[PDB]
Design a protein around this ligand. Structure first.
Ligand SMILES: Nc1ncnc2c1ncn2[C@@H]1O[C@H](COP(=O)(O)OP(=O)(O)O)[C@@H](O)[C@H]1O
Lengths: 188, 191, 103, 191, 373
């Protein structure tokens, strides 16, 4: 096996059948430990999830002093509470929605308001898209629409050169069927 | 990078009794145990601890015994009864500290990477010294100097949460260093 | 397999005893090292996910309150009115997925 | 049935990175650990075996436990990269065996020396008369290359137990050809 | 293979005692006294022409190797590849011996230093800075070897013969000679190390002279006979005077690299005399007059304002300048060594400070003892 080219060829053709056989199951063990670490990740998330307390929903009626508030639970009584440390006391306005501690009962976190689903009718429909290429033959009024609506909110510097305010709004009068909604939807 | 440590007053307290536990056979003049913690930010928090068997020889001062297996199981107990808490380091007493503390620390940095140690002072408790805490960094030493370990210091304080001040204020009951002071109280603070 | 025969042609006492050891000896020592590291860490972490699953089993216990999820937020978040006519908040939901839930 | 505390002491110095024993000197001493851990287990299900290294440090990587599966796991990745330090190896084995949780067990140490030891004759005979004042039997079994039966090794074994002592064998091996058959001849039944 | 050294027995003097000792050691398959024996042959200063005659045997070592420390294995192949004396195939030979141990023993880092040891002579910019940078990317978690930084300085020492390596060399020359400890080689190389160390802090930007190197022995014990002008001009800097005679006599002595930076010499000492004339009076009257700067620094009157705004800009002082009196106010925060005989005067300041605290504490306690309680 020193230097016959036949036997030293067979020196590793008994070895390469072993050294890939010991390498084949090891990446399988890499995969199995990878899936178990993914499963252990879910368990430790639940150990984090198990220890939470749950909170009380309430709303701020008014502010008394720099630390005394008057809140009210959704179904229960009124209270006098405080903040945690850094809850930005200027942001708490009379009418906001907050979340209270269960036992300490002070304010943990404020919440926005998403009430009365009749007004919740803005998130299901589409804005379009319509981009002034679908609308036909009405462009002379379209340009006159876009100065008083689009140009305030996109471009207030022009209204400060001459010195003029208006975000006011229009009235679209005309017999039905023609264009009275698409112009609204195109500029929206 | 540690701002300051916060000593919950059960831990020191639970060191002094354990010094008094071995004090009936007391010939060691040092007590080493495990310091549980709750790392939150650059400021550190400690609220629980326990002890561990440890010995040390005056000759050659480098033969020492932290018990790993006792440290495994009893921390496995305190994890099981409270999964909030984990290890942050260790403690000892005897303010003239043995130089073996390089070896104690570099062992159990494999439990916590940024390991930390707090020295309490059970018998010297008189003038100005609550505790002391070190941090472990290792430069060489300086620009043109040989290698070294060089324990560094992080400042310390004694913390307070609710339902331990309840345990504090019910246990003082004698003079208490009463609330916001009079003329005599402020002058003694100046003394 | 041409180079497998062809390297047995050129250098007969230079890599036939050498190359067919060096990248196979260093292979089998790393394969011996890493067949036991992953296997022991496999068996250890099966025990820890066993013990955690036993721990979740005890704290997930009947009886249950029923309720109705009113809405869902993320900053993952839910506002829940119980059938005790009491509205609660939780920042963390628990042993479901937020995307699997609906009001 | 007999109650003792076995403290096996292996070598992982540089001088075990060679092959006078034909597979590997590590695999020679590892299989020696297999036959002594199975011997103390099958002789008594109430004994306990913990390991201690001696190269570059002495580490108590497994404590004195009746478990053996952790010991067999720690036999792997031993990394023989150290340099032998032997005078502290007895002292770190003895004060380990004064932290016994069952203090009715006897005390017996076995040690694997596969490196030439470089120590004073005075230091070991101070350790030998220390063990005379402490009643601990130590079995020194020579491995690897072997400066065979030195004045250091023979006088330590003699002053371990003089005037009809145990018979703690200073076991010598042929450096290479020959398995642990001589290692199971005398000491594993008649120490 | 035993007969391979029986025929290549020559050029190692005392042939039976070292070659027949050699064939005992690897035929018993040991690898440490064998390693000490082969290290003994290569450490031997000879011509050592049999590097090719031993690298076949070194390949025979790596055939049935299976145990050997790659640290000492690469430590001996860097002398072999030094003996090869042909850098073209030497790099390819090194990278093959580099990749044969990619294992957990970090000798690959000193392979990279062995790359730049042969590449800061040819191919000197394009990947030399990369094999500079890659080492301290890996010089982590372990100060225990210290030969890792020892050889990392050795490429930085060859990187001294670039342009902008004067202070960065000077910072690293302290790092090396700090991390290595023993002297372990004669004066005839060490005193030139101190010679290039004194010039590197001389040209360095942020350094003033960084004293206690005068206290550090590797220049004072090694150049106390020759090149005393450099110890003299380090005296004049750490004693901050202009002292125009000998600080010109260093330019009389040192002809290269000193007249080219003579303007920077006079620039540094005129902002180094400031932090000693403010060190002289202990802030009782630290309002220094402008003429005292113009006398000590021997600079003209119109340049002292740009001189003190410079030292304020660098940040070795935090004073201010008035010009209705043209006097300079000094609030100073750049301290230095204070030479144990002046620890004595520092002791007496501390004791006067001590007894004033204690005495009039006793006056307060005795005065208000009745209402203190
Ligand atoms: N000029 C126009 N360009 C493009 N589409 C138009 C035009 N006029 C009417 N339509 C189409 O007629 C439909 C009715 O338009 P709509 O705005 O709803 O009528 P009304 O203006 O009465 O509300 C729309 O779907 C729109 O597609």
């Amino acid at each position: 096996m020193a230097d016959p080219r036949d036997k030293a060829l067979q020196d590793y053709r008994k070895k390469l059948l072993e050294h890939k056989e010991i390498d084949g199951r090891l990446k399988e063990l890499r995969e199995q430990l990878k899936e178990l670490t993914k499963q252990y990740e879910k368990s430790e998330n639940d150990l984090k999830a198990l220890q939470s307390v749950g909170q009380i929903v309430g709303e701020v009626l008014k502010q008394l002093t720099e630390e005394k508030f008057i809140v009210k639970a959704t179904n229960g009584p009124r209270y006098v509470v405080g903040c945690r440390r850094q809850l930005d006391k200027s942001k708490l306005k009379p009418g906001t929605r907050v979340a209270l501690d269960m036992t300490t009962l002070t304010i943990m976190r404020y919440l926005p308001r998403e009430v009365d689903p009749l007004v919740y009718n803005m998130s299901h429909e589409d804005p379009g898209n319509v981009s002034y290429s679908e609308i036909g033959g009405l462009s002379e009024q379209i340009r006159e629409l876009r100065e008083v609506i689009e140009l305030p909110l996109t471009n207030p510097e022009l209204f400060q050169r001459v010195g003029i305010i208006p975000p006011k709004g229009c009235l679209l009068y005309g017999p039905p069927g023609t264009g009275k909604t698409l112009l609204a939807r195109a500029v929206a | 990078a540690v701002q300051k440590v916060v000593v919950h007053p059960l831990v020191l307290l639970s060191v002094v009794d354990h010094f008094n536990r071995i004090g009936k056979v007391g010939n060691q003049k040092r007590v080493v145990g495990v310091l549980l913690g709750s790392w939150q930010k650059k400021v550190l928090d400690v609220s629980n601890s326990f002890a561990v068997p440890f010995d040390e020889d005056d000759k050659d001062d480098s033969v020492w015994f932290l018990d790993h297996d006792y440290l495994e199981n009893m921390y496995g107990m305190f994890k099981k009864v409270n999964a909030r808490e984990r290890i942050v380091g260790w403690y000892h007493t005897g303010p003239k500290l043995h130089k073996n503390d390089i070896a104690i620390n570099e062992l159990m940095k494999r439990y916590c990477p940024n390991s930390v140690l707090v020295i309490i002072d059970v018998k010297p408790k008189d003038l100005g010294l609550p505790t002391e805490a070190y941090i472990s960094v290792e430069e060489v030493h300086d620009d043109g100097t040989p290698t070294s370990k060089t324990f560094e210091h992080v400042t310390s304080e004694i913390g307070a949460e609710e339902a331990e001040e309840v345990g504090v204020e019910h246990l003082l009951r004698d003079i208490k260093d009463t609330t916001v002071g009079t003329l005599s109280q402020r002058i003694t603070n100046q003394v | 397999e041409q180079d497998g025969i062809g390297e047995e042609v050129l250098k007969m006492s230079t890599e036939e005893i050498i190359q067919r050891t060096r990248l196979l000896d260093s292979e089998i020592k790393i394969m011996k090292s890493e067949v036991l590291r992953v296997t022991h860490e496999l068996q250890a972490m099966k025990d820890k996910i066993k013990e955690n699953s036993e721990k979740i089993k005890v704290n997930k216990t009947l009886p249950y309150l029923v309720s109705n999820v009113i809405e869902l937020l993320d900053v993952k978040c839910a506002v829940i009115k119980t059938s005790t006519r009491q509205t609660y908040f939780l920042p963390v939901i628990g042993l479901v997925d937020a995307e699997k839930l609906k009001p | 049935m007999v109650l003792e505390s076995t403290m096996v002491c292996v070598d992982n110095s540089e001088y075990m990175r060679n092959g006078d024993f034909l597979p590997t000197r590590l695999q020679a001493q590892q299989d020696a650990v297999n036959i002594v851990c199975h011997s103390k287990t099958r002789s008594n299900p109430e004994n306990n075996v913990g390991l201690i290294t001696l190269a570059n440090d002495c580490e108590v990587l497994t404590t004195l436990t009746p478990d053996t599966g952790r010991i067999l796991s720690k036999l792997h990745t031993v990394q023989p990269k150290g340099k032998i330090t032997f005078c502290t190896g007895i002292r770190v084995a003895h004060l380990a065996l004064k932290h016994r949780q069952g203090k009715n067990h006897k005390m017996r140490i076995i040690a694997f020396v596969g490196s030439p030891v470089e120590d004073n004759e005075k230091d070991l005979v101070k350790l030998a008369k220390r063990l005379k004042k402490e009643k601990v039997n130590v079995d020194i079994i020579n491995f690897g290359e072997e400066e065979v039966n030195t004045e250091k090794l023979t006088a330590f074994v003699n002053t371990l137990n003089g005037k009809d002592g145990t018979g703690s064998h200073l076991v010598t091996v042929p450096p290479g050809p020959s398995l642990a058959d001589a290692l199971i001849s005398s000491p594993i039944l008649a120490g | 293979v035993p007969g391979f050294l029986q025929q290549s027995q020559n050029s190692g003097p005392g042939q039976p005692a070292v070659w027949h000792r050699l064939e005992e050691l690897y035929t018993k398959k040991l690898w440490h006294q064998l390693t000490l024996q082969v290290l003994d042959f290569v450490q031997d200063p000879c011509f050592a022409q049999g590097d090719g005659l031993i690298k076949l045997y070194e390949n025979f070592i790596s055939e049935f190797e299976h145990r050997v420390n790659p640290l000492s294995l690469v430590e001996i192949i860097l002398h072999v590849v030094r003996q090869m004396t042909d850098p073209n195939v030497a790099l390819t030979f090194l990278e093959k011996t580099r990749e044969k141990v990619k294992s957990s023993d970090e000798a690959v880092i000193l392979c990279k230093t062995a790359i730049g040891a042969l590449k800061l002579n040819i191919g000197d910019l394009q990947v030399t800075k990369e094999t500079i940078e890659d080492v301290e990317e890996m010089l982590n978690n372990l100060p225990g070897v210290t030969s890792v930084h020892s050889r990392f300085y050795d490429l930085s020492s060859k990187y001294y013969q670039t342009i902008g390596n004067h202070a960065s060399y000077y910072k690293d020359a302290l790092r090396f000679l700090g991390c290595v400890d023993i002297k372990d080689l004669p004066v005839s190389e060490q005193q030139e190390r101190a010679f290039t160390l004194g010039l590197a802090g001389l040209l360095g930007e942020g350094v003033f002279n960084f004293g206690e190197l005068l206290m550090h022995p590797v220049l004072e014990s090694l150049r106390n006979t020759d090149r005393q002008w450099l110890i003299d001009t380090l005296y004049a800097f750490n004693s901050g005077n202009v002292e125009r005679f000998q600080t010109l006599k260093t330019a009389w002595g040192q002809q290269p690299d000193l007249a080219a930076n003579e303007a920077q010499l006079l620039r540094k000492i005129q902002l180094l005399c400031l932090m000693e004339m403010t060190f002289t009076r202990p802030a009782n009257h630290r309002q220094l007059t402008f003429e005292e700067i113009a006398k000590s620094a021997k600079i003209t009157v119109n340049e002292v304002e740009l001189l003190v705004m410079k030292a304020l800009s660098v940040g070795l002082v935090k004073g201010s300048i008035d010009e209705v009196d043209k006097r300079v106010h000094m609030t100073w925060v750049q301290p230095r060594v204070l030479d144990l005989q002046q620890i004595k005067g520092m002791k007496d300041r501390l004791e006067f400070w001590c007894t004033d605290v204690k005495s009039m504490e006793m006056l307060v306690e005795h005065q208000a003892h009745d209402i203190l309680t």
